[PDB]
Amino acid sequence: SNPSLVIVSPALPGANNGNWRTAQRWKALLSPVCSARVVQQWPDADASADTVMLALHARRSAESIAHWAHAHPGRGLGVVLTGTDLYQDIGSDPQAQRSLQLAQRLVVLQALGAEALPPECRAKARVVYQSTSARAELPKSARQLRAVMVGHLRQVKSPQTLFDAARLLCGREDIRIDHIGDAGAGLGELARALASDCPGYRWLGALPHAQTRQRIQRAHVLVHTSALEGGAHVIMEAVRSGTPVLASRVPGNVGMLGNDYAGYFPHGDAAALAALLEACRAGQGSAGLLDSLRTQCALRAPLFDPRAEQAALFQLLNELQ
Numbered sequence: 001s002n003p004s005l006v007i008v009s010p011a012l013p014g015a016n017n018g019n020w021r022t023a024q025r026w027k028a029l030l031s032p033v034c035s036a037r038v039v040q041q042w043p044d045a046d047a048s049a050d051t052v053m054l055a056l057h058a059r060r061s062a063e064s065i066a067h068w069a070h071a072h073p074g075r076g077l078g079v080v081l082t083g084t085d086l087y088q089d090i091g092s093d094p095q096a097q098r099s100l101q102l103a104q105r106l107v108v109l110q111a112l113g114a115e116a117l118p119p120e121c122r123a124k125a126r127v128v129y130q131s132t133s134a135r136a137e138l139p140k141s142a143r144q145l146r147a148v149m150v151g152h153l154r155q156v157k158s159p160q161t162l163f164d165a166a167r168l169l170c171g172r173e174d175i176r177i178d179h180i181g182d183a184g185a186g187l188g189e190l191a192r193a194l195a196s197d198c199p200g201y202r203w204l205g206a207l208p209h210a211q212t213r214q215r216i217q218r219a220h221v222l223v224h225t226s227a228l229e230g231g232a233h234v235i236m237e238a239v240r241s242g243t244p245v246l247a248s249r250v251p252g253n254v255g256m257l258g259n260d261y262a263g264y265f266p267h268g269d270a271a272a273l274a275a276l277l278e279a280c281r282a283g284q285g286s287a288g289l290l291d292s293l294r295t296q297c298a299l300r301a302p303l304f305d306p307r308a309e310q311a312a313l314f315q316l317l318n319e320l321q
């Protein structure tokens, strides 16, 4: 008999964020070989038919992870390290550390993620790069540089780095920056004030996923400053659109873009990001940095094909059964 998979995701049904997107897409991808359902907590009324658990975020789903582990000791449990659990919580949070213990498998969303796990947990760690649909790569104009950052405003995304970079460039009309993401910490008020002082910066608020991918595809560069990432959706969405990236040098980003990528800046170093934006703009009048990055990003694009994520999921599913 086919397994009955239950995905635990802390996102609210229908929400437009990474946690919901992973869960829905994993459900669609595993449905050829198993019955799949997504819940916010476990157990529930239908819990006794479940045979495999895939739980997102070792701390936020901790109580559901522990209920499963106590209900099925030694069998069927995979814990997915979404970012903040892995680069924050497992250093000191007791529940985060418990879920690492109890899991049969540990899923990290890029290659560098197991490095951040304790050594006794690496043997059961598994990499599942995420996937996304492609968009055709558009030729873009050389007359100005348009940059986009996408992420609901949370401190973990370090929007202050984009804020400060925008200011360093307050006086350049040939460089434009659009910021997509809900207000989400008072960072909204900081974006409105920036937008008023520097007309080259625009905070678009939250945008539905289709329009967001369109703007990623239309922009010259995606910018991503996060202090930590499990493996950000927005970066593969750019890569699979032919839109290169500039990103903070953090393991979550470096696992996605490559160890040798030429588009990193030290995290929170706003000046280093402004200079990358300047070098990208300078290269349009002349191969410049933009095309180097694009060449490097085209080499990363196959990592985010849906057939490859499903194959990784299939094998993980066998191992939990």
Ligand SMILES: CC(=O)N[C@H]1[C@@H](OP(=O)(O)OP(=O)(O)OC[C@H]2O[C@@H](n3ccc(=O)[nH]c3=O)[C@H](O)[C@@H]2O)O[C@H](CO)[C@@H](O)[C@@H]1O
Residues within 6 Å of the ligand: 016, 017, 018, 019, 020, 021, 022, 023, 056, 082, 083, 084, 109, 130, 150, 151, 152, 156, 180, 181, 182, 205, 206, 207, 208, 209, 210, 212, 213, 226, 228, 229, 230, 231, 232, 233, 234, 235, 237
């Ligand atoms: C740890 C961290 O810092 N982020 C993690 C978080 O995703 P998190 O939600 O933080 O950020 P992601 O980039 O991964 O996902 C955001 C998704 O929402 C969409 N979007 C966002 C704002 C908006 O206004 N309009 C819109 O459509 C983006 O295109 C993207 O598809 O959990 C994911 C796994 O579930 C991980 O892959 C992320 O690395």
